[model samples]
Target: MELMMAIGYLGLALVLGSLVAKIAEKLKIPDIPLLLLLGLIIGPFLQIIPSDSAMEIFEYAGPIGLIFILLGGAFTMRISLLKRVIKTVVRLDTITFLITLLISGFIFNMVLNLPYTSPVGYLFGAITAATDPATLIPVFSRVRTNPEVAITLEAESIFNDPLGIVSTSVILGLFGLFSSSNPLIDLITLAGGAIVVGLLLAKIYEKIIIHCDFHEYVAPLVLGGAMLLLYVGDDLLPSICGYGFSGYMAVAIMGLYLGDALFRADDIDYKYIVSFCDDLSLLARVFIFVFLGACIKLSMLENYFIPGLLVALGSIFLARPLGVFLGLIGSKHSFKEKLYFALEGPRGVVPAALAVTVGIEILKNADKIPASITKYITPTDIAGTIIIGTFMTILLSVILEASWAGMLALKLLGEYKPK
Candidate 1:
């Protein structure tokens, strides 16, 4: 497609998606699923947009949108309030994430047992384990939920993005998909290095913003640039530094710290930064879900329909609830709160982004692997299953969770009241 045409098409998509989202809001429906539906109609259903064009758009938009979404969420949070529930949030994030990983792996192994070893199954589990922050951030913004509930859900999702990424990366590395001295070491380096980098960058930004007394308009440029750098730096510096770091994790951590500094310091107003990030995120959200719709191939879904359905249902209904129940043990939240958490596990863009990325890598390396290694599972098979399954799970989970989340929040946690 011509550059001008591509730009025009994208603009048209954004406008149409925004309008649909607005209508959804007025109708008290979740906009994400509606946007996805629109993408489907214009994409696979009617072929209004070519698949290649859609995929290319998503390749860039998904990750960039993700960074903005996380940053926006982190910017809105209050560190001191977050601290009160930190311990519980940590346990919930860690325990629930792992549980979902193990359980989903076990079930997928049974259902989709093509070349499936435990590791491959576990890898699939890891991809789908974490709830999506992109999906949850908007839901929390709109729904009047308990602050604790909103914080716990949003924070856990943001933190788990890196966990899921590292976990999947390590698994791929084990399959010789990534060149690393030690996969376990690389995983640690990814998470640990991201934390250090994010903290350093955030501190530096805070100091510069305060010292320079920059106009509020520059806040987004500075913070957004930092996020982009953190992302690009993580990808590029691995070879130079001899270790891999997670850009996603680093950016998220930076957002948290930056938010804390902005909130606590009297020198700067964070409103401009927050407002800009929120608008950017909303735009990103619209672009992502619509392109995501275009990326979903009907053939893959048709071929793996039963397995996809089973995996999606099992992960959301069985694995998520079990994970939440065990994770929240000994917490002070009421049963209804736990129940709401259990029932609302919407998967989102990160998994789709990672899955497509991994798929490309596997395809690129297809010719290099030994027949014995690829005997049961070819690279194409792995890529196809991961991409198809990830998309299916995301669609199903988003539809189910987004529809019920608001009602559950109101019923269980009561309506939100102003502070």
Candidate 2:
């Protein structure tokens, strides 16, 4: 009965999500914030899907949802394009991402009044450090933006996701969550192992599909393999070393490698995978975003509501802008484009996915948690706050920036021009 009810809720999410997206399109707005609001109203307020049920579904579904979103975004990334914009892209991604993380940490500490060394700040900051390509791509698709600026944002969004995930792991290690024997080595192993695993997986996949006989049915296998890569890189390998790697990073590397490989293999009509994932990611986002929102309750946030809101707004108005403005100092984009870039980073599925996992992990492993963290705040307190704070950040970003991206583009970037 529980399983059946969950299935029904997912179907409802898809249906309502589609309707909301269409409505958003008609309204000339993005649907993410609205989709989340629908979930909040019905799932939490109306009690159609209770918080417990929503969180349950989120645990099993969140990782799969992330898989589709990451793989789809990675497939679109071009190595050549990245190299061309390497300087500005690198500067923007690093500077903005670091600035966002730093300020977010400071705000979390200042407002929450945790010990100066609390891990919550680092964990939260890392999870939300990157700009969401999923959010930016659709907006850019519809609105004309400066060509250079558009590509720069798109590339940064795609590339930073892996960096963000890996950063989260390193933070956990530094804070003694993942056996802080040698954090530097762990970071190297965490990243390096995932890259090797991804490359090997991609090569093995290519060899198997070399005959092109599986072109019609290859997409399902590819997606399955993508999921497998996540497990091997994130879960399976970790058991051997006592610390998990970033499956997000592995999936990204595999997607990019396999995408370029497929492009070279003309016999393979690889658009099938892209097409398959396009629809899958739509469902993924709808389900993930809505369910994540539904998991929030007022009581969960009562302690930190105002603080969370302040941090969310601070991230938008201060951290992101300072990073963008300073990061692009030597770039050739006009002042307006820089300003728009500074204003337009709306948080998306990466943080949503990461928040769920963090909450679940801390909830389930409270006993295993160490004093380094438990000394500062109870596990339950931190666990509860992570989701609520992340939700607020994404929610505010959607309202303040995503909703106006098109108009901002019109004012700052003008219409799309054929180069």
Candidate 3:
């Protein structure tokens, strides 16, 4: 009876999420915030799913949903178009990412004066470094912004998502917040190894896919299966090979290679695959935002409201703008492009998920943690701040930046036509 009830609830959630999305589209509002609002009503406020169960659901659903979204985006990616903005995107993904990381860390550390070392700031900074594809992609696609601008945002966001995670992981590992020796080397190995693995697997799959007349579902299944393999491998690699590996990176890379190499605009099969992935991705987004909403605790927000709000302000106004300017300093983009970039650093699900997961770990193993560390920070303190800060940032960014994307692009670029 309990299992049946759970299944019914899940089904209802999906349907409700889809309906909310349609309403959001008709009104030109960001679906994420709306979905989150509904999620809050059902999960936290109504106490439909207790906080503990919500966390359990997030553990499995969050990553899986993210995987589908990333893979879907990659499957439709255009390498040629991306190459045009490669330099700009790379700068944003790397130099801008680093700058934002450092700045946010410094601000959070100085402002919050949390109980941990400066490395904790770095961990927090890294958590917010990547612009959320889930948030940005929907807006950009709907706005039909400049091709260059849209492509740049998409490519950079996707590229930086795993980089942000790897950066955060390295910081945590370095500070003994997590495990591993030689955190920097482990970071590089994991990131690099995933790309290599993804490329090799994608190549083999592409060959098989192109040669064989498999059913439409076969290719996507293979792609999804490979992602799961990489995800599992990433988890086990630290033990298996004495270093960590990034399955997320692998999934993104595989999708990129597969999409560009095999799928073409004119191909019927390609269209079918793209359509399928697009719907799948939408379903994933609906799950992610609603579940994220459900998992949020209003009590946690109350406890950290001031700190979370300040950190969010610093992130949006101070850290992101400085990073964007520093990154695009020598670029040939117009002033409008730079300003838009500066204003658009929205954090997303990755940070929230990581914060919750790590916070849980901190709480679970509090006794094992050093008194020096645990003295100032309780598990609830760390987790609460992170989750609250993330939710706050997302809310502010979506409302301020994403909501105005279409208007801003039109005002700045004289109206772009979708290709």
Candidate 4:
């Protein structure tokens, strides 16, 4: 693809996405469907945006978008509000995730005929198990609803990404596909290390504002700092602590840590930070979702459609609902709130990225795959299956969840105002 053409494609996407967002905002609904449709038209269907170029754009832009979006969302949140829903968040994060993992894994294994020993299905389950806060926060922001239910869902998404990564790594280790010593230990290092980094960065920035009248450069510093946080946590920590941290969670914590006081900073008003972060987030999110469709290979989707769709359906109707129901067992949440929980779990960039990461690694190590594990399916075929399964699941879940979030939230949680 030509360099200018790639840039041109991105510019075009930005324009199209803005229009879609405007339409969505006017309609008081999540923009996912319209934004995604733009991708489909420009991608597989119409072939306007080159697939590889769209993916390349997504690869660079996606993480930055996630960082800012998270920062923006968490910055407006109240710590006290978070405390009230903390326990429910824990249940939904752990129990719900485990159930989604096992059930979806089983379905993936059986439907795709993946060897139980290889357990790529289980790995895929780990990848797709968590909900996407990048998409969820924005979707939920449009609708007024029960704070407890909203917070629980949003908090679960943030916490669960790390769980998915750690758990996926554990599964990879167990299969002799990758190596990680212990998840309990990994959790301590990743979560604890990320917390320190997130807090230290926020405090550093906070003190800078408290002491000085610095202006203009704060937003850039923040953007850079956010990226560095992810780099250190996701990239450096694995080598440093023998485990990488969840940079996503770290960013969330940082945003929430001093959001209240952040706006009151000296010379430079926080409004600049707000505008910069939010604008950049909006752009990045548009690209993130638009390319999500652009990256799909229609032929691969055709080949894996049945099994992929089946795995997706299993994740949505069976796995997610059951997990939400069971996880909420001892909770005081209403049935409607629980249903809202189950239906609103859309996916975003992490699973798409991880799915490709593992899929690539699997292909690279195809020869190393044991004969028994590859009995029915070749490594290349299995890798493609897993990747497509993930993409398909993400596509279906996002469409179903985000697009319906407002209407359902109004009906369930916002209707009579129960929680």
- The candidate maximizing lDDT is 3
Determine which window of 10 residues in candidate 2 has minimal summed lDDT: 74-83
* Candidate models: Cα lDDT each: 0.67, 0.66, 0.69, 0.65
Give the poorly placed runs of model 3, Cα more than 4 Å off. 177-180, 264-266, 296-298, 370-374, 377-379, 414-419
Per-residue error for 108 in candidate 2, Å, reads: 1.8
> Each model's TM-score, in the order given?
0.89, 0.86, 0.91, 0.85
Q: For every candidate structure, what is the RMSD over all alpha carbons to the true structure, in angstroms? A: 3.3, 3.4, 3.1, 3.7
Task: Write down the TM-score for model 3.
Answer: 0.91
**Per-residue lDDT of 1-419 in model 2, one digit per residue for the tens?**
47787768677777778888778768976667777788777865787866666676667777777776676555543333445656777777776677777777677666666665777766656655655776547343434564555666656766666666656665576445655566577667656766888888778876777854666676687688777766766677777766666677677777667766766665626455545555556666666677777654335767666666676667777877777787778765466656755664465677666676667666656566553465446445665666766777667766776666666666655443768
TM-score between candidate 2 and the true structure: 0.86
Q: Each candidate: how many clashes?
A: 0, 0, 0, 0
Rank by TM-score (best first): 3, 1, 2, 4
Model 1 vs. true fold: TM: 0.89
What overall lDDT, based on C-alpha atoms, would model 4 receive against the true structure? 0.65
User: What is the clash count of model 3?
Assistant: 0
The superposed Cα distance between candidate 3 and the true structure at residue 220, in angstroms, equals: 4.1
Among these predictions, the greatest TM-score belongs to 3
Residue 336 of model 4 has an lDDT of 70
In the range 72-97, model 4's lDDT, one tens digit per residue, is 55543434456676887787777777
lDDT of 3 by residue, 75-192 (tens): 5444545777678778776887777777777776676565446455656666667567755564447446655777777777777766766766765763455444565776677678
Candidate 2 residue runs with Cα over 4 Å from true position: 75-79, 135-146, 174-178, 203-211, 263-276, 296-298, 367-381, 413-419
